[PDB]
Each structure stands twice: as C-alpha cells, then as structure tokens.
C-alpha cells in the first residue's frame, strides 16, 4: 500500500485511503532534539511555534487549511490538512510560507511574541506536569553527556539566550533535500502528489547535515528531585533497550505487554491476567503503572512508570515488580506469551490503523527517514506470531538479568531506597 | 432494531450499541450514571472475571460511556472474532445479574471517583449550571451521581427494564461485513428483548433565557455564557464556534473554549473564559460580549468550518447534516450566564 | 508486603540489622558495638567447651 | 478444611436417595441434639471458624439485621458459658429456627475462588 | 466616643464596646471574621495567657462577637473590678501584637471550625444566599471566611486601623455607675485612639427584587423567601413575623422560622420551611405564598407583638422605638426565593 | 499517655500482663501456661543453689 518514489533528493511517500474524507500533506525532517547542543536547546521548539503563529495560521484558515507540527528526538514534521481536491493549495502554502520564504515569519514582534509564549509553556510544564517531567529526567540521567539526553521542549535557562540568528543557523544546517521526506496521507494518490511537486520547483537547500562526533551510550545512574509539598510520588525505572533497526525489536515490545498497564480505579483493570496484580492489591501499593519500550536511532529504554499515594511502602512496590521481571529469564509460561501476542496485535492495529491522517503522516514519514521504507501491518503480524518462549528467555537473560538501571523520581520519595538495594533485585540468589 | 455496517480491508473491527438512555431520560438523579457502571459486571451465565480473561486471549476490549442522550456499549477486537463479541454485548443488555454486593464493592466506589474528578474542574461545573438554567428538567438533569437523591438497587433494575428495549437501540459497526452482522444480530439474545417504545420525543424542548447563577470555588475563576439553538439555526452557530477559536478572530486569544453540542432536536452554544486572576476574567468577558453585540461576519470562516466538521464526522456514524452555504452574519441577543470562582470580583449579568 | 516484614520473627531481624535507618556520617568509632557482640559470643562458646573438662 | 462444596455434594446424594435418607437422617438428628449447642442459644452456622478469607467475605455480604442478631447470640453464649450454666429451657433454639442462613453466601464465595484458580492455570489449545 | 450606663443594686456588671466593623464593611471576604478571632490575643504589654489567668482570679470573662453590622467586645465581671476591664478592653483596640505565628496556630484553626459548623446547617446556607441576591455588595457580603479570597496578615492589620477609630465605636455598660465609667474611659488608652471617620452612611441600600438561586445539598431540604424593607415599613413586618409564628395563624404549623433583621437604614424579612421530605417542603411553601397573596389582617397581633418586642429589647441598650399602632393589613408583592437540598424536586419561582 | 505505656520497658509488661485483652469465657484449663512458667523458675533457682555444692 505504501508507495515510495525518489526525485532529485527528496523522497515522496503516500498511504492512499479512498474512504478517507480528508487529505494531508507535509514534510518530515530526519533531525530532531538529539541534534542540538546544551546551549541552543529549544531551537526546534521555537520553529514549531513560529510555523503555528497567529499571522501564519490566519492565512491558512482563509483557504480552509489546518496546520500541525511535532518535535521528537529524531524527527520533526510540518503538516497541512485540507479537504480532498484542495491538495494543490496545501502544497502551495507549504512552499511560499516555510520552504522558500522565512523572512516574514522571522520578523521582529513576531519572534519576540512567540518567544514570550514558549517561555511560559515550559515554565508550567516544569512545575505542573510531574509524570512527564520524570520521564524526561530519566533520559537526561541515562544518556548524560550524549546527544540522547536533551529535552525536546528545551530548557528555560537555554531559551532566554536564543535570538533570531540562531534559528537561521539551524534551518541552514538541517532543512535540506537530503534530510527530508514529503508525505501524503488520506485521500490522495501517489501519481497526483508527485506530479504536483514537479510542476513547481519545490526544492529545499543543497548542503548536507553535520554529523555527530559521539554516539549515545547508556549509563547506570539516578537523579532525585525530592519535593515534600507534592501529594504523591512519581518514579521511572528502565534498563537499556533496543534500537529501531534491531532483530529483537518486536520481542522487547512483546515483553512489555506481559506486564502491561494498570488503573486502580477501573473495575475491569483489576481483573487482568497479570500475576503482578495479586501482589500489589492486598495493600494498595500504587494508583497506576505502565510498561514501555522506547526505541531510537542509537539505543532505547525498557521499563515502567508509577505513581502512588502509599508513600510508606514504596520499597514493597519496587521489590515485587522487579521480582516478576526475573521470571522472564527462568520461568515465563506459554499462556503468558500467547496472551501478550493477542494484546500486542490489537495495540499495533489501533496505532497504525486509526482514523487520523495526521497521525499516519508522522508515523510513515519517520519510518522512511530511518530505513528507506515502511513495513506493512500484515508482515509485522507474521513476525509477532513467530515468537516463542525460548526467544523471550534469551532476550531477557541478555538485557535484564543482573544489569545496570536508571532511576528518576520526584515528590515524596524518601521511602525510595538507595541504588544498591534496588539493583540487587535484578537477580535471585535462589537460582 | 437498526443494523448498519461499513466494510474495509483492515485488521481491527469495532462494534457499538447505542441506547437512548442518557441522563436526559433518568427517572432519578444519577440513575443513568449508575447503570453505566454496572454494564460489564457478572451476568447470569458468565462472570466479569471470566469475560476479561477470555477476551484478552482473543484480542479484544470493552467499554461503556454515558452522555446526556446516549448510553454506548463498544467493543474493539480483531476482525475474525465477530460472533463472540455480538453475544457478549447481547448478554449484557439481557441478563445482567444485578447483585447486592456488586453495587457496594465495585459500582458505588467507581461512581465516587468519577464525581470527585469532575468536581475539581471549574469548567465542568459552569457547563452543568448552564444546562440546568436553560433546560430545567430535560437536558438539565445532572449527568453524574452525587448521592443527593437516594437510588436503590431496584431503581437501577427498573431503569434498565425501560431503556433496554428492541425499539430503543441501534447497532453499528466499522470494518464489519453488514450481511454477516445482520445474521449474528439475529439468532441472538438481542432478538428476544422486549419490544418497548422509543423514548425519543420529536418536539423542541422548553428553554429559558436571561438566567444567571453564581458558585463560590477555590481555584480558577470561570465566566461562561450559553445560548439555546433551534434545529434550523444549527449551522450558523457551528460556524461561529470555529470562527471564535481560530486565527481569523482577534477574540480567540481571550477565549479558553467554545463549542456547540448537537442533539436531534436542537443544541446549546457554550463559551468559556478561564484564568487564575479574577481581574483578567472580568475584563475579557466584557470585551467579548460587547464585540459580539455589534455583530460579526462569518463568511470568511465557512471553508475552514467545512474541513473541521469533516474531521469530527469521520469517527461518528450518524452526524447531523449541515449546509454552511447560507451563513452570512451574527448578532448576539439574549443569553444565560454563570460565574464560578471568586464571584465577589466577577461581573453580574446586568453589567455585561 | 515482603515476607521479611510480615513474619513475627523475621520482622525483628529486619527492623534491627537490615532496614534500620542509619546516619550516613558515622565513622569507624561506631564499629565497637558490633565488636563487643562478637566478643561476648567468643567467651561463651569457648567457656562451655572448656567446662566439659574442668573440676 | 473440607470445602462446603464437598460437604453439600455428599450430603445431597444421601437426601435424594430414599433408602439412605431413612437410615442416615434419623441418626443425624440425634447427633445434633446430643451436641447441645442449641442449649446455649446458638445456631450451627455461628460455630463455623471465621479466620480465613472465604468466611471473611461471606460475613461482609451478610445483611445488617442478620449481622446484628448473630452478634447478640455470640455474646450471650460467652456469658452463659462463663457461669457454667445453661440457658432457661424456653430460651433454647428450636429445630425450625436452626436454618443455614450463612450457607448460600459461603457457597457463592467458594465458587468464585475456584474459578479464579482454574483461570490462572489455563492452557490454550490449538 | 459615646459613653453611657445604667446603675442597679446588683453584684454583676457588664461592659461592651461596639464597633461599626461588621462584614458589610469588609474590604476582603472574611477579613472581619479574622479580626474578630484575633481580638483577645497577645498585646504589646500583656500575653493572652496572662490575661486569662489574672482575670479568673478576679472573677471575669471576655468574649468577641461578629455580625453583619458590628464587632462587639464584651466583659462580664464583679462590680468592683470596673477599672481593670476598661484598660483591658482599651489595650485590645490599641496595641494588639498581630504575630505571624498566632495566625497559623490559633486564629486560622478557629475560623475553620466556625465555617465547618455553619456549612452543615441548610438554614444558614439559605439565609446567606438570600442576603447575596437581595443586596449584592455590602450587606450581601459573606459573613465567614472560607479561603476563596486570599487574606494575609497585612490585610487584617489594615482593616483594624480603619475600623478601630475614636469616631467609630460606642461604649456602654450595665449595672455601672455612669459618672465613674466616664472618668475611667477618659484616662485610659481609648482616649488616645486616632480620630478617624464614621463608616455608617445615612443613605438607603440598593436592593434587587425577583431573584432566585438553587443549591444542592445532602440532608434536609429548605425553601425560603426574602423581602427588603425600608424604614417606614419596619413596624408592619415586625407584626407579620410574630403573627405567622404564633398560634393566631393557621400557617404556623407549616413555617419553621420567620424573623425580621433590623438595621439603621432598613431591614430584611425572612421565612423558612424545612423538612426531611422534599414533597412536604414543596406543598407547604406553595400554600404559604398563595395565602399571603390574598392578604392578612395583622390587627389581632399588635398587643402580642408589643410584649415580644419588649422582651428582646430588654438587653439591647439602643433599640429603635417602633409604633405598631397603625398596622392594619398586609399583601404580598415581589420577593426573592432560594431552594436548598433536593432541588430536582422543589418548585421554581415562576410556579409560586 | 500513662507512664506504663510510654516507657520502653514498661510497655512490654503492660502489653503482655496488664492490658492484654482476654476472652471472657476461658476456663481453668487456661491456667496451665502460667504454672509452667513457675515450674521453670523453681527448677532454675533450686538448681543454681545446689550447683554451689556439686562435683
Ligand atoms: C546478617 C546479614 C544480613 C542478611 C541480609 C541479606 O542477606 O539480604 C537480605 C535480603 C533482602 O530481603 P528481601 O529483598 O526483602 O528478600 C528477597 C527475596 O526474599 C528473594 O531473595 P532471593 O530469591 O535472592 O533468595 C532468598 C534467599 C533465602 O535464603 C535462604 O535461607 C534460602 O535464598 C538464598 O540466599 C539461597 C542461597 C543460599 C546458599 C548459600 C549457602 C552458604 C552456606 O533477603 C534475603 O536474601 C534473605 C532474607 C532476609 C535475611 C534472612 C536472615 C538474615 C539474618 C540472620
Ligand atoms: C532465613 C530463615 C528462613 C529462610 C527464609 C528466607 C527469607 C525470605 O525472604 O523468604 C521468602 C522468599 C520470598 O519472599 P518475598 O519475595 O519477600 O515475598 C513472599 C513471596 O510471595 C513468596 O513467594 P515466592 O513465589 O517467591 O516463593 C516460592 C519459593 C518459596 O516458597 C516457599 O515458601 C517454599 C518454602 C521455603 C522455605 C523452605 C522450608 O519457592 C521455592 O522454594 C523455590 C526456591 C527453591 C530453591 C532453593 C535454593 C537454595 C538451596 C539451598 C542449598 C544451599 C546450601 C549449600 C550447602 C550447605 C553447606 C553444606 O522466599 C525465597 O526467596 C525462597 C528461598 C528458597 C527456599 C530454600
Ligand atoms: C596514628 C594516626 C596517624 C593517622 C593520621 O595521620 O591521621 C590522624 C587522624 C586525624 O583525625 P580525624 O580524621 O580528623 O578524626 C578522626 C576520625 O574520627 C576517625 O574517622 P575514620 O573512621 O576515618 O578513622 C578511622 C581510623 C581509626 O579507626 C578507628 O577508630 C578504629 C580503632 C581500631 C579498632 C579496630 C580493631 C580493634 C582491635 C582491638 C585492639 O583509621 C585510620 O586512621 C585509617 C586511615 C589512615 O586521626 C585518625 O585517623 C585516628 C588514628 C588513631 C588510631
Ligand atoms: C514501676 C513504675 C511505676 C509507675 O508506673 O509509676 C508512674 C506513676 C505515674 O503515673 P501516671 O499516671 O502513668 O503518670 C502521670 C504523670 O507521670 C504524673 O505523675 P505524678 O505527678 O503523679 O508523679 C509524681 C511522682 C513522680 O514519680 C517518680 O518520680 C517515680 C519515683 C521513682 C524513684 O512523685 C511522687 O509523688 C512519688 C512520691 C510518693 C510515693 C511514696 C511511696 C513510697 C513507698 C511506697 O508514678 C507513680 O506511680 C508514683 C509513685 C512512685 C513510686 C511509689 C513507690
Ligand atoms: C557487652 C557490652 C555492650 C554491647 C554489646 C553494646 C552494644 C552497642 C551497640 C551495637 C551499639 C550501636 C553501635 C555503636 O554505637 O557502635 C551501642 C551504642 C551505644 N552504647 Fe553500647 N554496648 C555495650 C556496652 C556499653 C557500655 C559499657 C556503655 C557505656 C557505659 C554503652 C553505651 C552506649 C551508647 C551511649 C551508645 C550510643 C552511642 C551513639 O550511638 O552515639 N554501651 N552499644
Ligand atoms: C563475658 C563472658 C566471660 C568472661 C569475660 C570470662 C572471663 C574469664 C577470665 C578472665 C578467666 C581467667 C582465665 C585465665 O586467666 O587464664 C576465665 C576462666 C574460666 N572461664 Fe570464663 N569468662 C566468661 C564466660 C565464661 C562462661 C560462659 C563459662 C562456662 C560456661 C566460662 C568458663 C570458664 C572456665 C572453665 C575458666 C577456667 C580457667 C581457664 O580455663 O582459663 N567462662 N573466664
Ligand atoms: C515451658 C513450656 C511452656 C510454657 C511456659 C508455655 C506457656 C504458655 C502460655 C503462658 C500460654 C498462654 C496461656 C495458656 O493458654 O495457658 C500458652 C498457650 C499455648 N501453648 Fe504453651 N507453653 C509451654 C509449652 C507448650 C507446649 C509443649 C505446647 C504444645 C506441644 C504448647 C502449645 C500451646 C498452645 C497451642 C497454646 C495456645 C492455646 C490456646 O490459647 O488455645 N505450649 N503457652
Ligand atoms: C552488625 O549488626 C549487629 C549484629 O549482627 C549483632 C549480632 C550484634 C550483637 C547483638 C547482640 C544482642 C548479641 C547477640 C548474642 C547474645 C545475646 C549472646 C550469644 C549467645 C550464645 C553464643 C549462646 C550459644 C551457645 C551454644 C550454641 C552452646 C554451644 C555448645 C554446643 C553446641 C554443645 C555441643 C552439642 C552436643 C549435643 C554435644 C550487634 O550489636 C550488631 O550491631 C547492631
Ligand atoms: C503473660 O502470661 C503469663 C505468661 O505468658 C507466663 C509465661 C507466665 C509464667 C512465667 C513467667 C512470666 C516467667 C517466665 C520465665 C522465664 C523467662 C525464665 C527465666 C529465668 C528466671 C526469671 C530465673 C533467673 C534467676 C536467677 C538468675 C537467680 C539465681 C540466683 C542468684 C543470682 C543468687 C546468688 C547470689 C549471690 C550473691 C551469690 C505467667 O505467669 C503469665 O501470667 C502473668
């Protein structure tokens, strides 16, 4: 279904869907937050809000277009959505407002107003959004002094020094033809999209992006943002995971599905077939947890995030969850693998097969900037079905058994023990 | 008993059963909220635990949602388990156990959590009073259950006997073969339900204009206005909501939210201004009201609102058919007003 | 909870030599108390085995 | 520590057999009278040991009026035994009043716990 | 600084200082409640503990009371200890310490208890709602502190300096030699207070008619009505209050309470119906308003009112003299209405 | 709090001897535990005084 062409440097990829009632086109760059330095951190956040500025978005509304933009560790995207048949105007808007003319957007009183608003967006994120600011400090401590440790939103201290001249430097170095993929999702044909691009000039810059000296490397460490005025405790814990282009990519994803997510206030969440639940329910140890498996270009992270009000029994929560991770190496059963297979296929079919062409454009553009193509959903189901119990035990013994960990936390975390007591739980002396 | 489906070459399927049993049909305060939190408990043939464990090994999930018009039972599953999930939903509407200890241990604690979450938001509070003062006993019924009116286990059983009838529900599906769905809907326990009557009333509801209400609250101050809308002027207020929260308007920076909730007999237009400081809330609401009284031209926003309406209608299966081709102007007349927060520093209706 | 905290006998061991919260600044002079415990064990065991041959 | 599901299964087979019912039920009635718990103002369902999760669930779901009455019979029996006497003959529990009031709650809690153990040890075929 | 007293052959004396600093003069919500709770704390020359211990050995007690018009400081003691309690009251109004640790340890927790025991009574909640919708700012100000508006220690200090002035207080005593009281007040710290300005205005308070409000509540249901009264009609509504509650009226068995609150420039009439059943409350209030709209003859209740007036004016040293002799009939016009409790089963204003 | 409950050593005596909640219907067979603790004290005290004269 995915069709990918090449044209003088830029790559065109589409995912046609006749039943859609909305087409979407845009450009996805293969550079993100991991391509900055601790002094220009936050440049890609300013470029996102300049694109969605009031004057820029007022022009788009008259033609009937809506704008979106996303910033990640590896990629950033700029999307224009419109009704089918209006795809010609969306390409025209992208050309003369972001690709070829950035002077009007980068004017004074428009850069000074956007910078004022972003400085407020990160001030309240740093003091109101606790679960998402300990997952950001987990990246900061696990990849310290490496490119994979800078926050995607930037830093408050770093954003007060950025000027308009720093935004032109980043655009000249990264917004290039060799670093870009042109995407189209929804009700739009591959032949029509490529014909429109060649009917115009539609050429980005010519240079190549700079290369990074050092790669990302995991380091076992911890950071503690203790605050005794907050009513809860938020904790994130992870080991080194898998990159995107790995043979164990789906095996690590299936492993996180065995433990899954949990909500204490949902009656149906308390009946899940997870052996961890019967340990943490007699005494209410947590309100919620989720197990993740994040992959990037260089490395990844595998672990869980928790939030609890039972501040006197945090040690019990950590001890029981890590003891269930040990069974992935020694005694994982066949019923647990079959259940996690069915729930992973449903979860994948709800992310790639949603009804939002904007979500599809980000997913499709990011997978082509890394491996030059997109793996279909039918082929991934065949790879998930092939996983066996011996595969899980081999992967867990290599990545989980007796390995270093990274910890982040905030709130009332006096009851969280030291690093060595927690690291002792990654293995059993009885085995 | 209406059955319809749309087909597609995909992996995941969706099945929904919509019942005309929302908060606007509740006989007692919050009895519809309590029936929502009993929808996937034990039945007379299968336990709640057994259903959760069995569907996990097949690749599916369940959910139930409540609003002021509908109670919706939804199932998301893999495309080949269709007959299993038809009967699971048929058993819910037919033979729910309604045990005395299920209400005490699972249903009531779940309802307390929902009420406590919505109470902490001042915008949800201001919207509830706007529905209460505009429509008094119809759409103005409380959505959630708070224990002000006593509701017993027999009350919930009685309410289910009235809304779970063959003439009061519709069945819809996405990425589902329609011929196969019709076969499975028959030869099922849905076909043996009582054939009652449709609770839908076609006449326009009674509304009230020029009302006011104030609530003291610790947190953020909120000022809101509300306007009842008839069936023939839904498109005019659909353009106005998108225009007021877009880059085409200078008031969009002072507005926190604005929407039009649509029903089969009319709608309600809502506009909210929210800030931590009550001096900004008082100043912003005065500028918005004065500007809307002079009048606005909504023709530039017609094309924008055509695309936004397409985004929302992709998920919905029975949206309201609108035109937008004849919307020209707007001038504010009469409206209702609610102030939540530090009310001693917020304006009254006569001062706006 | 953990078996080391719920058991009647293990909870006395856990509360005294496992989970006891100690200041992080105590030097080697705070080690003489544990040495006196080893001295008392040494004297009792050697005395009993010697008492089997004493008049 | 025999389950009440096992007791009921064996007991019913005796009651549905006409031959066994006429030879076993008369013995059981004399067994109960000689036990003498009715002379302390107690029903049999008050004698079941309660320090397990199954009986703590059943006692939680018992209605308030039954729960208040049970607490009075238990307190009265402790004070009567304290004095090394019996209750006056007119205060003794009658045979028609010795009914299994707690048994349906015990069986319902036992069936739920057994189905949970059979689903934790599930094995999927094909 | 007006001083007055009456003598008697009695062993107990009382001394009161009335300040025009009630909740209707409050700059912030609950700032008058916090100053009232801060009254008999440490002063700059003496501690709170020392005052209690020393006064107990002399036979005396202290009390501070707050209403919508006054803040009153009262001392009950043995007759011969008069000069001790004149200086003690003068020191409170002059040199209160206002320590930061006294607000968090003693003053704030005491105000939380007063608010907690008043939010559980539906009659007190309904009366405050009636004051709010009749008069908006001023007499309609909240009485107690609930933390909706942030009040700091500097705000309490500023409020005290505004109200504790020489021209804003009156001194009165019971069983006190008037000649001796004037000499003691003259040479105390009261005579060195700032000479500010009187906060009482000679005009009439703006009021509103035809208003309504509903509050949800778990417990007893209350329905109430409110009528603003001017200076000329004060005697007519005083007879009406006593006629409705006494045995001369058939409606007395349906009325829970009824009273007239009298100020210098007017008053407010209140009537309450309260029961645990919402149907009983609904039927009673409808019958009350239909009977009063036809009219009443308040002549048979004049002599009864004269006795009741003299009973409650026995303690008050400045009672306004009413006539009661020219009162003939009553006819209900426009009024305000508030419903508290099971509001989904209580009548609206337009149905009365 | 009473001194018998705040003291470190008296709390153990109070929780086991003074304020221990007992069922009201326990008969005289429940008196053998306290007798067995008197037998142990009798044996130890008499044995030690005899051991001063034993070879
Ligand atoms: C004094 C030293 C302090 C002891 C603390 C210590 O070793 O770590 C405590 C460590 C921390 O407790 P935990 O993390 O809550 O329990 C971990 C799980 O029980 C799970 O623990 P596990 O799966 O790692 O193993 C439990 C443990 C159980 O130990 C056995 O007794 C077996 O198993 C063994 O150690 C078996 C191997 C022993 C063979 C060595 C033969 C040498 C002779 O617990 C243990 O491993 C032992 C239990 C606590 C101490 C027991 C008594 C010690 C005091 C005397
Ligand atoms: C110290 C004094 C007493 C020792 C107890 C250790 C303290 C402790 O934390 O134990 C509980 C601890 C687990 O407690 P937890 O994780 O804190 O929480 C309770 C769990 O729900 C507990 O549930 P779970 O699923 O974790 O428990 C299953 C586990 C435990 O389940 C049981 O309860 C089984 C019975 C355990 C005690 C047996 C008596 O099943 C096993 O027994 C499997 C392990 C058997 C392998 C034995 C490996 C050591 C062999 C010793 C030979 C070494 C000597 C060398 C030569 C000597 C020199 C000549 O049990 C173990 O770690 C098992 C110890 C191995 C048994 C020997
Ligand atoms: C001769 C002393 C020369 C050492 C020197 O220049 O440092 C002076 C140094 C200056 O004192 P400071 O470090 O400012 O304060 C002493 C700290 O409280 C002591 O703090 P600390 O725990 O670091 O000191 C432990 C100390 C000595 O540790 C002890 O206190 C342990 C005493 C020995 C008992 C252990 C075995 C028992 C055998 C039975 C007899 O061990 C050392 O001095 C080793 C590092 C060289 O004094 C010592 O370290 C004391 C050494 C006397 C033995
Ligand atoms: C064995 C522990 C006994 C015990 O529970 O004593 C605490 C108990 C305090 O009772 P509480 O109600 O738990 O404590 C309330 C306050 O501690 C307030 O306690 P208090 O103000 O009643 O404590 C006063 C007490 C202060 O207590 C002491 O200084 C204790 C004497 C230790 C030397 O000083 C006396 O009045 C003791 C002298 C009079 C006793 C004459 C008996 C002579 C031979 C028989 O003190 C006494 O029983 C006083 C008598 C002292 C020994 C009498 C021999
Ligand atoms: C067999 C004899 C003794 C044993 C087994 C013993 C044991 C202990 C232990 C294990 C500690 C805690 C660890 C430490 O502080 O090093 C301690 C602390 C202490 N001991 Fe001893 N002890 C004995 C004799 C004594 C004597 C004779 C004294 C004083 C005359 C004493 C006074 C103290 C004090 C004051 C502390 C607390 C000091 C501090 O923590 O700063 N103990 N003892
Ligand atoms: C804290 C415990 C103890 C201390 C400090 C202690 C101290 C001593 C000392 C200083 C001597 C003199 C030995 C010599 O000078 O050669 C001695 C001798 C002796 N002790 Fe202990 N003792 C202790 C415990 C015991 C116990 C528990 C026993 C028997 C159960 C015991 C049995 C003996 C015997 C049999 C001798 C004979 C002399 C010898 O063997 O050297 N002791 N003890
Ligand atoms: C020197 C030896 C012993 C002493 C000092 C002792 C002491 C006690 C005491 C004080 C009690 C509580 C009061 C009572 O029930 O009488 C008790 C209870 C008990 N003892 Fe012992 N005991 C000893 C030996 C034993 C033995 C050998 C057994 C069993 C083989 C045993 C089993 C029990 C049991 C089961 C209870 C609880 C009975 C109940 O409360 O219903 N004890 N013991
Ligand atoms: C590091 O943490 C610790 C810590 O671990 C310890 C232990 C202590 C010490 C604490 C104590 C309370 C001391 C413990 C010891 C005692 C109270 C006394 C010890 C008692 C004995 C040694 C008696 C045991 C005697 C025997 C087994 C007799 C031997 C004879 C036999 C086996 C005869 C042979 C048999 C036959 C059949 C022929 C600490 O102070 C401490 O610091 C906090
Ligand atoms: C709480 O319920 C109970 C209960 O549980 C128990 C066990 C008992 C019974 C027993 C006890 C409480 C005591 C338990 C006994 C022991 C722990 C045994 C310990 C041994 C002793 C107390 C005796 C020790 C004696 C000596 C060391 C004295 C030796 C003689 C000497 C030193 C004299 C020589 C002097 C010179 C100068 C040479 C109860 O009575 C009771 O009801 C209150």
Residue numbers in the entry:
A (entry chain L): 27 to 457
B (entry chain M), E (entry chain B): 17 to 368
C (entry chain N), F (entry chain C): 1 to 55
D (entry chain G): 2 to 127
Q: What does the original paper state about this entry?
A:
We mixed the supercomplex and cyt. c at a ~ 1:12 ratio ( ~ 10 µM supercomplex) in a solution with an ionic strength of 20 mM and applied the sample to holey gold grids for analysis by cryo-EM. Analysis of the resulting three-dimensional (3D) maps showed a CIII2 dimer flanked by either one or two monomers of CIV, consistent with earlier observations. Combining the CIII2CIV2 and CIII2CIV1 particle images for refinement led to a map with a nominal resolution of 2.4 Å. Densities originating from nine water molecules are seen in the D proton pathway in subunit Cox1 of CIV, which connects the highly conserved Asp92 on the n side with another conserved protonatable residue, Glu243, from where protons are transferred either to the catalytic site after binding of O2 or are pumped toward the p-side of the membrane. In addition, two water molecules were identified in the K proton pathway, which connects Glu82, near the n-side surface of subunit Cox2, via the conserved Lys319 (Cox1), with the catalytic site. However, in contrast to the earlier S. cerevisiae supercomplex models, we identified a cardiolipin (CL) at a site previously modeled as two phosphatidylethanolamine (PE) lipid molecules, which is similar to the CL identified in Yarrowia lipolytica CIII247. As in our previous study performed at 150 mM KCl30, we detected an elongated density corresponding to cyt. c bound at different locations on the negatively charged p-side surface of the supercomplex, spanning between cyt. c1 on each CIII in CIII2 and CuA on CIV. We also observed density that is attributed to 7-8-amino-acid residues C-terminal segment of subunit Qcr9, which interacts with cyt. c bound at CIV. The C-terminal sequence from Qcr9 is also composed of a majority (~ 80%) negatively charged residues, which would explain why it could not be observed in the absence of cyt. c.
